[PDB]
Symmetry: D2
């Protein structure tokens, strides 16, 4: 028979979850779908405490024998943060597929309907198991660890320039290309099912004349971590170095990432802080927050940035 | 005979430690492309380049290009903020003579260092008469990028400088320049921005957009006297309820807010439902440069918005 | 007043069978942007479009643009060979009025079909005063590509039309056109090519380059009277010993040989030690179009090579 | 101690030289010996115990299936030895993706096989060959590189032989897999692995050519406006066993191409519909003649079809190979 798929709605312009389902009745030929309204917000207002609750609910659903996979509708702007959080914390090999739309549901040539169909097909395919959390738009299956919104406004915005897609959906058929060589889901050390709150982590940009006082402000409000969206390969001005050294003196963990959009920030002993490997600032903040729920050991956190 | 090209050095791994003359003598082939003079303007890693110094760089380039014995200028620079320096000069250099920034992703001592060929290409571009009137250029890895579109897209690769949606102005293949595009924007001799009499620039900071982004960072920027804030927003400059509160406080105190995007590419469109101006297709670093220069001429938000659509 | 735009239909799945008026009524918003008139030129899948028909298409567009009551033309077309038809008109249409090809990767009946918004964007482009004088354009997926640079890069995706090295002329975001580039090539009103009196075109075939590529395919093309051969070469138009023998036989019989590349992008540079001319950055399908038009004016290889560097 | 790596040289610009250092074209490929290349990069000896072997010295546009067959057989011999930990193969850029994918399907070992090439001749200013070779040796000698299929390394990137292609005629960064990305990257003397390909290769591949002396003939025909039926006739008459069609869009066929393919199939020729576009999926369509290439581009599709024809004539089996290899 058909796979059993829960469509868990959080908001986003792709949207009422039942209104969405009935607007795309073809999904009912791909799966037995049940809609659940988890929240209804624009994703720029999604917060870590709500994402935590999202992961806890998804873990509960996937523990059920009558649930084969979950599709999560979400706004595009921060889907990559929510998706990567669940990538590290969902303790199941059953597919979890985030889906979103770049055009509103009323727009001409709205992309939401076909994105949803594709997400349900992916979530219901036996071959989709064990691949980590996925993000599906525009016929592409992206890994939550590599995929990012690369363009403010286009349909094809979700890309992983250096890492490619896990697969594509063409002609109602899934073509799997890659498995990511990173830890996730069932292999992940992270289990947050007993957590109720998350560590505070802020992101500071790197640019000519970047100011020291933004580090001061972050320290004074009690951040546990700072992610630096650095110039080039996490390069730091003399002002940023002063700010990072002050932050580390107060026990704040600093991760140097990159503002460029892609690539590796390599280790460098003459610079302060840890390095983000190929994690962009938004993903690096998610991983650092979760790491800080378990450890403050810099060697462990640095390995996590190389392996997750 | 040969064009007269000044190689104006600011630092960077293409040299920074080595002096400009060490670079020239390491690549003696440049002397077959132009009569080259080295001038050491500074010698810093580009992450320490500052607006006050970029201001002086533009003023010095303007003096050089005013001379009849200078046909063009090649500016050696670190990769990390070359796109900020180049766009500043894109808007303030008052000449059609070529200004070409060049950089290297590998240090000059590395195996297969890219600096030598990047410099050779930059000199060929700066000395070609067909390069005039094209705006400020950034040359690496056989590519000629416009200062308005080109950005460092990768932390660590040789091919990092790309303009994903706008492409390259031209390419250099087999010792020949192939020009592909002219940028459909105002620059250089048609720009209203003139800083030849300025000594300082308005303070403009950049704040990131992300889940749980904090209001206090807006408070801190206001309390330290920023005149503008560039917001590297989620998606098309979308703003959380906390960012909205912070922007409303900044605007009440007269700070100009530009909504840009953290994504890397594309258009932030006007939106009546959100605070602030929009950055068009300017990324946060370029938006900060334009906003700083705009604030030297006006505080009218409708004029600043038009600058962002035309420069 | 609204611009007057003709929607000239040739086929493709954007109307897939379906008449042009049905497509217009499926996007009634176009009537708010322009006074539109549909004209059914043909109704075929674009893999069956032929040079003789493209010739007539070019002649009909020139007739329409000669009229004072026509401000621009949108041409609906299949995706598979739109880049061939579009580049042909890019070289042969004698007007600065916009000519905008539009297509769809999903059939008109599909869920989330891209045709309606592509058509709406194409009409917005064709009717905008800022769109004049830019050469022939191809509009899909919010992007405006030049017919000289744009190509179908993916067999099956909505975002397939890209120009990796040259970017887009502009984009359409939030019901507004953002122009980024003007192509630095000759086209339309500055093109030497005129086919308004022709009824047929010279025969030109394309042969692939690959390991073990066979000499007998050159023999066959010669025997069937080709006037030109475009070679989709390995790398930068590299040729095996078998391809060299085939090209030398073709050139001895007066066949003009153009070396292009199978790679998808970039410059095939001059190499006097290899037979034939080089395609500059033209891919094999575009190179065939230019070679056909070049042969209507000359058989001089030096002149043809200059065409490939300027068009 | 250090891994033992054989550098097996076939030719290419990476062994190319010229009269001056300013010409990046007009040089001559396959003119420097492998020991000249190794001695130009002596740092390789701190990464591995290296042995150079001159297999051939030709421009890769002249590489042929008969020689690629011998290359696969020689690499299999080398990797069977206990004193060989991996192999680096220097090769011209123009057809490295064909040679690499052939060995991807036929090498019967998990030890790394890494193809390396250069877009600038060895004498050029800022020549890329030296660092590409050092990266390839680092990759071939790392035990974490085992079991990943055959790799192609240039410009700090590790590409799978199944996805990587030369995308630009002339640039250093030409080797890309737009939709599938890189297996890994090499930054700061360190390898970062990102992906494992979800396809069959090497030790899990059914293709074995170690006893073969010849390969089936397969030609490639382009799809375009006015494409001629006579090229199909010519291919049939010269005895092709397979035809790969570099089709318009998603393997779409004109009325002339359809007539040609039906003639070929009536004569027993296997037709694979691929795409000239550069990327993406050619989907099944029973309304059209032939099999479909999945995401294989024409040059890769030709290699897989040649190897498929060494073991099967069953179209269901061949189509399944194109979906799984
Ligand atoms: N800012 C909105 C955009 C619309 C959408 O992507 O759904 C959101 O992320 O929710
Ligand atoms: N952080 C250094 C990197 C070296 C370089 O790019 O030249 C700089 O930007 O100067
Ligand atoms: N083969 C069809 C594909 C559908 C389309 O692009 O319209 C054509 O090019 O006409
Ligand atoms: N045609 C030459 C160029 C080599 C190269 O660029 O590596 C070959 O493939 O051998």
């Amino acid at each position: 028979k058909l796979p059993n798929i829960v469509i868990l709605a959080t908001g986003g312009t792709i949207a009422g979850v039942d209104t969405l389902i009935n607007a795309v009745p073809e999904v009912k030929k791909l799966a037995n779908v049940k809609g659940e309204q988890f929240s209804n917000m624009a994703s720029e207002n999604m917060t870590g405490d709500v994402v935590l609750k999202l992961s806890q609910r998804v873990n509960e659903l996937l523990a059920r024998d009558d649930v084969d996979g979950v599709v999560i509708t979400h706004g595009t702007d921060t889907v990559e943060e929510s998706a990567y959080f669940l990538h590290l914390t969902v303790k199941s090999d059953k597919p979890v597929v985030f889906v979103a739309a770049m055009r509103p549901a009323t727009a001409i040539s709205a992309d939401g309907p076909m994105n949803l169909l594709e997400a349900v097909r992916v979530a219901g395919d036996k071959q989709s198991r064990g691949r980590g959390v996925m993000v599906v738009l525009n016929d592409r299956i992206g890994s939550a660890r590599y995929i990012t919104k690369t363009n403010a406004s286009t349909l094809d915005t979700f890309k992983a320039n250096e890492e490619g897609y896990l697969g594509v959906i063409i002609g109602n058929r899934i073509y799997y290309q890659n498995r990511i060589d990173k830890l996730h889901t069932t292999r992940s050390v992270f289990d947050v099912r007993g957590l109720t709150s998350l560590p505070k982590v802020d992101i500071l940009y790197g640019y000519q004349d970047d100011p020291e006082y933004l580090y001061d402000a972050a320290i004074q409000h009690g951040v546990k971590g700072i992610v630096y969206a650095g110039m080039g390969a996490g390069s730091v001005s003399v002002r940023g170095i002063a700010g990072m050294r002050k932050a580390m003196e107060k026990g704040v963990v600093v991760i140097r990432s990159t503002r460029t959009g892609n690539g590796i920030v390599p280790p460098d002993e003459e610079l302060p802080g840890l390095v983000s490997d190929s994690l962009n600032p938004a993903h690096a903040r998610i991983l650092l927050m979760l790491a800080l729920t378990r450890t403050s050991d810099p060697k462990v956190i640095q390995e996590y940035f190389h392996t997750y």
